[PDB]
């Protein structure tokens, strides 16, 4: 954690696959973890144009950016500097499933992202691959315990070209490269945030991408004590 | 909403079937809709002991108290004095499958609540049919529109004997009984709840449940307009 500063800078490097369609990408931004804002930079540096929506891609480009406030330990910036990893998958409504697997280390006073993706099932007529999404919604991700980690768990609505949402289930664990000895591990906790497309250009092989993130605790009472 | 009193009473009828095994339950109880608390105080009344954790039931027992502040439209209570229904289906990720049809409609001055539960392929040696669960922890739901109803989507999780917990996905569909003219939607828009079991007796064919749930829309800044 004196390893995570106020400002911070991360380097990506993306490959994957979705749909038989193969890419690679890179990205490279700056944030303030501790109030939980960040920006990407994004290039489609291989594969480019893609020909589903960048929208699929977006939770792939950083855990160490969430607000934990002075109250929630902070299983990210706890593990440095060895780090951690995630592993998802993700399952939208309408068939696609996208998994993902990423590494996050320091180098250098930077943070480093190695992020690897394997997508299949989008449907053909679908608005992942006809590209007629238009961003994320808002979501709450609830994070708890589970085996030395953390797993979290997430739905997210993706805003349809027309007016509708098609909606998918995030399913991840997060692994610290910290021997538990050094973790303090929180309760059952959420994280809130909100993802936004600031920019792009040359049909999404350039992309900015801005999310702030906020951890809380349940602050409803409780009749179990307590309780108001 | 004139009909929704600052203290409101419900009673209601269950019947079901998980894994071959039928039951019945009624429940009586009270809450404070604007402030979104309430207690149920359930028998079951037909099956008992029932063979399960009756944990599962714990969501089939009232979304007209949701504390909606003065800021978000109130679906819920913008229905009556014709009511709503709602329809759920909630995925176990160790296969238990529970879904569950709900009629709420408002009877001199009293809500009534009739809801009708299948479910199928709880694991025999599973932690529900092993009656080894300990209550679920707080969740949020997102809601949004859909097709002149709200849809909403929750990841639970159920504390398990020995200190695991096993998770489920809710879908919900929610529509009133009055007509789209009459109804001012929400956006996007979230429920924190957290939902307590008070006291039970009997092998569970005696239950007492307390929920309080707020709703919020995202607080955060937006980089779209507008942004801290």
Redesign the interface.
């Given at each position: 954690e004196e390893l995570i500063k106020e400002d911070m800078h991360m380097k990506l490097y993306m490959e994957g696959t979705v749909n038989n369609h193969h890419f690679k990408c890179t990205s490279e931004g700056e944030g303030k973890p501790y109030e939980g804002t960040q920006t990407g930079r994004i290039k489609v540096v291989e594969g480019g144009p893609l020909p589903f929506a960048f929208d699929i891609l977006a939770t792939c480009f950083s855990k160490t950016f969430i607000n934990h406030t002075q109250g929630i330990p902070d299983f990210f910036k706890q593990s440095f500097p060895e780090g951690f990893t995630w592993e998802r998958v993700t399952t939208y409504e309408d068939g696609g499933v996208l998994t993902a697997t990423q590494d996050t280390s320091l180098q250098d006073g930077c943070l480093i992202y190695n992020v690897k993706i394997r997508g299949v099932n989008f449907p053909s007529n679908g608005p992942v691959m006809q590209k007629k999404t238009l961003g994320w919604?808002?979501?709450?991700e609830?994070l708890?315990p589970?085996d030395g980690g953390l797993?979290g768990?997430?739905?997210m609505?993706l805003k349809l070209v027309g007016g509708?949402?098609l909606?998918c289930?995030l399913k991840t664990t997060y692994r610290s490269k910290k021997p538990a000895k050094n973790l303090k591990m929180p309760g059952?906790y959420?994280v809130?945030?909100?993802l936004?497309r600031?920019k792009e250009a040359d049909n999404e092989t350039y992309v900015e991408q801005?999310e702030?993130a906020?951890a809380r605790y349940?602050d409803?009472?409780?009749?179990?004590g307590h309780k108001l």
């Open positions: 919604e808002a979501s709450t609830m708890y589970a797993e768990r997430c739905d609505a509708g949402h909606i289930n059952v959420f809130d945030r909100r936004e600031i801005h702030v906020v349940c409803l009472p409780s009749k179990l």
